[PDB]
Design a protein around this ligand. Structure first.
Ligand code: AMP
Ligand code: AMP
Ligand code: AMP
Lengths: 615, 615, 615
């Protein structure tokens, strides 16, 4: 009965629900006055003026490190695993404290950072990346992480929009067995970033005469050794920005999504205890770069705020072989695996031969995030990896949500449906609206746009320097609710099914076809292992269905077409399928269908996709 | 007591014994009148006019497919395993039915084949080879299979003697990791086959501009897709030829051994139930090409007639490594392994390191066929592979016998002797005759020529187009009996020991030395792993013993000589041993000693053997 | 209570203790009159005139082979393992007898060796090396083994000093996967050995036109085949030399340490039964070349005298991979592993990944010999290899001691201390003396020079041809006792700790710093895996501490320095650490610190060490 009460308590009485959790899970410097700013029009937390734990003061880094060093100093906080097998090591909580303290002082004294500044972070998945981020919040600064792979052009714009006067990177990065010049990329970018005063560089490889030029550049080791190991934290208000995270999804100048401190931290805590049923002696492993909210909230914040161990792997699922991912899971007794479908799709390709010897009884929970997960792949995940006896939480949420939106509970929710994300998390009032006829709440089993009626604490507060794009994008499209950008439907039993962003929905003769269903049914064919249905500027017929299929010399298309009508319908069967080797994806994993749309196709994926359509 | 009765019932009262089994195991279109044509001179089935189930009508393909598709449509019929590991797949009985039906129609409508025509088959061990053969009998045609390795010169003669107006092959064949141009070989051959009207080609690799020329050549896929999936069978008389199989053993124009339909099919059924104790849920694996009776009767007919699953592996025991044979046995839970000694001789060389991890508790029976099996190799087979707790049937029989001649019963016969084939199968009256003084039946423990007193149903009926060679070869050498061509002896306890074809017996001073005993004792020495004793045009001394030994710089011969006298005798010890790297063998496995005789040595084996004798 | 009595019995009443064991463990031809020659000055066995089992007659080879062939002829004596995996084989005791008998006759009749001659042996670890040695004692000859790796210059001098008129070698030696020209090395050496009459060569590889020239050179196989398989032994007096073993340690013309027959043989027997608790059905594996006493006493004499099986491996611990050492231990069910720390140091580097699958429950005892063994390496040895449930005897002894000096008993001694060798063996009266103020016996817990008060039977009797060096080296430095050359100390509980040869002790301001403690503490750091502290001609300060550290770009030295003071003291922390890739070691394993001293650095190790000091 837990979920039924706890969720209603969080919806009709958030003050009591979150007020209590807020004092429970976090250590405060100054108690908060009010829990949230309501919507006077008789309502829950206001969307326009969303704000939680008013006048309250606390410190992220203090909650992620200090309190645990002063309790379980000898317990491990970070468990690292290099790109190469035996190159790992752990960092106790006591030592992380020391490290984050020398770095906090490096920032204040060597670089001149103050409370409120934007610190840009361009690093790979190594411990120093993590302590860097904690060092930034320890001093009341706001970190802005950029994927350690993005072009120097991407780096520049993000720093310029971010107001970042300083930067933090490495000299090079060995990924999946491939070195990557980051310091190089940093310099090309700084040829156009006027406000960059300093650049802290953590030599990871011992560079091949990599640039380093004046008092601008500083050495991580050189500077660290200068400061004591303990440094006092900087209290900040509950509603002061914790960080910024430039989301790089759709077209249009990247958005600097801004998150609160308390509110965001409480969500990461609530989701750890309920969603993953995390304890203190756990070993959480989130296979996602610090480049996206996944890595922010589940490979750094959630785990460290809770006080358990979080695993940092700077490598790839295929390096040095597909058994690698599972080799590091059984030696570290990882109790929490959390990865994206793309990865779970490539591992399922290599064959359960690499999973053979692995007993991996160390796991207790599995999780999926990033995009829809087909049923056969969910089953495969549930049986091969999970040895079918351990939960699987397919977590629905966004960079803006901060934390899980709708997800199954590792324990609270007894049942589970392979393509569903089960139920809305606590505080989230998920409803399905009619995309056409206003913001009408669809009650009976039906498909429509997903939204939340009231705001919650972990909800992003704005978009860096322009609260206008924020409103138009998230609150103006469907006045009164929050616009997720995705389509969904609740089955007879209430479960929620994510249809895959109704922005890529192909409307054939007024039918609106969501991608989730059509593509999953495709990939779920021995002939394929990945599918992507899109569209293009179409005059007549309204809009046709074209599928870019990728196999694992004739009439091979027709089959995949007659199978679409076999279970989905004849008005869903594509008018043309294109055979491609792969699909244009983001470092995150998501498939860029807007690229398949825009034009029928600049990475190598482009050209090959520029030809696989002409003929 | 089973064997004692059942065998006597089948000898003194075959009418009742086989008449009953005949109605039990096979589905008939029109009941047979008489069981067999006796020998009026008071006797069992006549040899000269051998004929069973008179006036009866049935259909092979119907008995191998239909009846089982209409009972257990979802059960697997063929389990394939490509030359490369994970390239396998299964064919249910329902689907095999569909396939064999489209192909039957391809033969009738696209190629013009009629009931009675000879269809030549030149294919590798792939499913299509199997459905092709079934397609041929479904329409009352007679299939003539030729080894997918034989020269184009071999192909031509076999087709010309066979009267084959059509052919069936692939474009190329990847064997043991080596592609083989078959379509090439087919074309060189058809430059001399005047009566070849059509050629059906199943593109297996997607050829590198392989020939295909006029309405003569037809595509398997192109043609198949044209016909419905169900096609009616063609009833044929019990005594109408099922197939022809050109035996390529001794010198002299290859013989087109012709087998009946009913009679041959009943033998394959009797031998499955008793010899292998096969059920319905079994997975039978016969490691022998469709090129010889072994593959006809135990990798196609026996298994499919019984209704279980038969495994089709188109690869080699050494590819991609010696563990391969056992890798496919444990995943498919093969319950019946049946292979030849040559293979069991090369696997025993690699060391029980490849058999280590393998539990292979899926097996229930082991079998040996092809040639004599030494004791140490039988033991090795019995202990390493069999984990000594599962039977081993060393099956004695020929292309002419159709089915097992003398063999141990997987259950019926409680004891077993490593170099013996135990007892004569039901219906077979095996006796040992004196090679010199007439057809005298030797009763007491002694060695002599093997023969059968009366005929049985699975006995070949003739030799294509010349019943004269048939008589001289099989029935005239020892009037009244059937001349096996081998030597044997029954021990005190009755077991029968095959001496290895008394046609290669070296008679030293009137002693007649069979090869079985002398060679087994040789190979059974750590210094060797294969031996071949023969002879040559010898004037004085009568005939000497020369052994071509192959190891796994002096006085190394003498040893192997003093060891021959140690257990066999000083008049058996060879006068000269030749050290060769290997021996001239047939695609079947048998060692060609008549080549070592003929001349002291055209494949590479020739030249090297042309020198290893001069010096 | 066993050890307490047995040891006191052997000290205050050796006549009864050893007299009884002497008749028990050895078969005599003529009983011995007196047990030992005492020191008239009221004492135990005299040092100056040490002699045991007077007037007694026996035969080594008879005690190592014969008696066991005439009891358990079918039991295995030698279990060989080539450098390449599956190239092994065993030699029963019956066959070893035959072999040692044909070789004894080869020596007498083909080469002219007589009782008393010195036979030089230059061979690798192959059976023939072992039978050669036994063949030599069988005829009353004295064998002088030289490492199959030493230069031809080393071979010459050892033969010249040895008086060796004959030699025994192979043509080449495949070691660790590297062929080694020995016959080559033998010939260069014999260009200066005037008294060499013959050279017996056992062709191991079948040479690439390797030299062999006149009646001087003889073939092992050619000669062996000439003699019967049984040949009578030659009785020799208890005190007649068994062998000579040129120790190649410190500087100065190599010493030909001469051992008795009976006395040495009894020690090897006593040490097997008590130290290793050996039985008859055991499989002893001593990983040490026949080049040093270890191989003499524990890979030949001890095992063969006892009547069990001894394993002969002619390969390297790293070939063909680090799992090799353990691969041969589980297949042969080795019950006794005995190796040197250098090896145990390189195997511990590869990671317990090669030890994973290995169950190796066949072991019953582990042993360490050669040099001090750090605690972490002892633990690693005790837990990974021993699966912590099997004893570990860190055996202290020298080439001169013949057999164990102070060691733990596989069973008799219940406790064990990782860096201790426990207690003095029976007959050995170990005491700690003051290096400065005379031969004062230190009683209370303190550090000093190790010595033995009375002699024992296995004690070397002299140094070939110059009993003068013998006295000055072993009995004159500390009159009355035996000078081991090492430093030690007994802890509160009596255990003895070897400090590492007080000849390499760095005396900083009158402190005398033994290497054992300082280096073990160093290597016991994740940053290193091998350490070597030495010194050099130092005027002021007295003598500084310089450590040559080898890792598994600044302030890396300081750490290892602050750690030295952390547990040992600030007056032990080195004044300078040198970073080298490896250390100059002897084929035995011992680290040559006198080379690091002599000069701050001819094998490749020299040059690199000649530079790693200048800068
Ligand atoms: N568990 C999930 N199932 C289906 N879609 C998901 C899931 N998690 C995230 N998404 C989609 O991915 C987007 C979030 O991307 P991002 O902001 O980069 O984390 C949303 O718009 C969702 O539609
Ligand atoms: N199990 C067996 N033991 C000994 N010889 C056999 C065995 N099976 C077949 N043969 C021999 O192989 C010949 C049959 O060859 P084939 O007609 O090609 O099957 C016969 O002449 C037999 O002598
Ligand atoms: N178990 C041991 N522990 C410490 N040092 C040892 C040990 N065994 C032998 N040694 C040293 O090695 C030397 C003997 O070398 P060797 O004569 O070649 O066997 C002695 O001087 C000892 O100091």
């Amino acid at each position: 009965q837990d979920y039924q009460r706890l969720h209603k308590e969080s919806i009709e009485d958030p003050a009591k629900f979150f007020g209590s959790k807020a004092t429970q899970f976090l250590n405060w410097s100054k108690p908060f006055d009010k829990v949230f700013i309501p919507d006077p029009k008789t309502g829950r937390p206001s969307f326009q003026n969303n704000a939680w734990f008013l006048n309250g003061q606390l410190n992220a880094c203090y909650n992620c490190v200090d309190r645990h060093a002063l309790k379980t100093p000898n317990k491990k906080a970070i468990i690292f695993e290099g790109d190469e097998p035996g190159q790992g090591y752990s960092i106790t909580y006591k030592e992380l404290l020391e490290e984050v303290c020398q770095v906090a002082q490096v920032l204040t004294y060597s670089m001149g950072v103050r409370k409120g500044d934007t610190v840009a972070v361009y690093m790979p998945m190594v411990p120093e990346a993590i302590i860097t981020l904690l060092a930034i919040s320890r001093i009341g600064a706001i970190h802005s992480v950029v994927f350690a792979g993005f072009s120097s052009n991407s780096l520049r714009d993000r720093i310029n929009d971010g107001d970042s006067k300083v930067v933090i990177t490495t000299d090079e990065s060995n990924r999946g067995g491939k070195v990557i010049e980051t310091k190089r990329i940093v310099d090309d970018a700084l040829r156009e970033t006027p406000g960059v005063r300093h650049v802290l560089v953590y030599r990871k490889t011992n560079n091949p005469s990599v640039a380093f030029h004046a008092p601008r550049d500083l050495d991580w080791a050189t500077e660290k050794k200068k400061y004591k190991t303990y440094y006092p934290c900087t209290p900040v208000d509950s509603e002061d920005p914790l960080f910024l995270l430039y989301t790089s999804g759709s077209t249009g100048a990247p958005k600097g999504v801004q998150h609160s401190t308390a509110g965001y931290l409480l969500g990461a805590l609530l989701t750890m205890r309920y969603t993953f049923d995390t304890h203190q002696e756990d070993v959480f492993f989130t296979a996602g770069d610090i480049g996206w909210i996944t890595g922010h909230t589940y490979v750094v914040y959630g785990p460290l705020l809770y006080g358990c161990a979080t695993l940092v792997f700077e490598g790839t699922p295929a390096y040095p072989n597909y058994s690698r991912y599972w080799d590091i899971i059984d030696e570290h007794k990882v109790t929490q695996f959390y990865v994206a479908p793309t990865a779970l799709r490539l591992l399922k390709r290599a064959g359960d031969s690499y999973i053979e010897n692995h007993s991996l009884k160390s796991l207790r929970c599995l999780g999926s995030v990033g995009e829809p997960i087909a049923a056969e792949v969910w089953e495969w995940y549930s049986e091969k990896i999970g040895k079918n006896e351990i939960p699987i939480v397919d977590t629905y949420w966004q960079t803006e949500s901060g934390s899980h939106l709708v997800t199954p509970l590792a324990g609270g929710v007894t049942p589970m449906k392979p393509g569903s994300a089960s139920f809305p998390f606590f505080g989230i009032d998920a409803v399905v609206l009619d995309p056409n006829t206003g913001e009408e709440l669809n009650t009976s089993h039906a498909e429509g746009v997903l939204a939340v009626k009231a705001a919650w604490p972990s909800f992003a507060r704005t978009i860096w320097k322009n609260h206008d794009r924020y409103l138009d994008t998230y609150l103006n499209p469907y006045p009164g609710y929050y616009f997720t950008g995705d389509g969904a439907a609740k089955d007879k039993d209430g479960y929620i099914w994510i249809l895959g962003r109704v922005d890529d929905v192909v409307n054939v003769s007024g039918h609106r076809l969501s991608t989730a269903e059509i593509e999953a049914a495709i990939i779920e064919d021995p002939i394929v292992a990945e599918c992507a249905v899109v569209g293009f500027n179409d005059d007549l017929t309204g809009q046709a269905v074209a599928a870019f299929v990728v196999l694992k010399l004739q009439d091979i298309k027709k089959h995949l077409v007659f199978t679409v009508r076999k279970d989905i319908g004849p008005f869903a069967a594509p008018k043309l399928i294109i055979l491609v080797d792969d699909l244009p994806k983001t470092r995150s994993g998501k498939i860029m269908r807007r690229i398949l749309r825009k034009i029928l196709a600049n990475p190598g994926i482009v050209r090959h996709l520029i030809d696989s359509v002409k003929l």
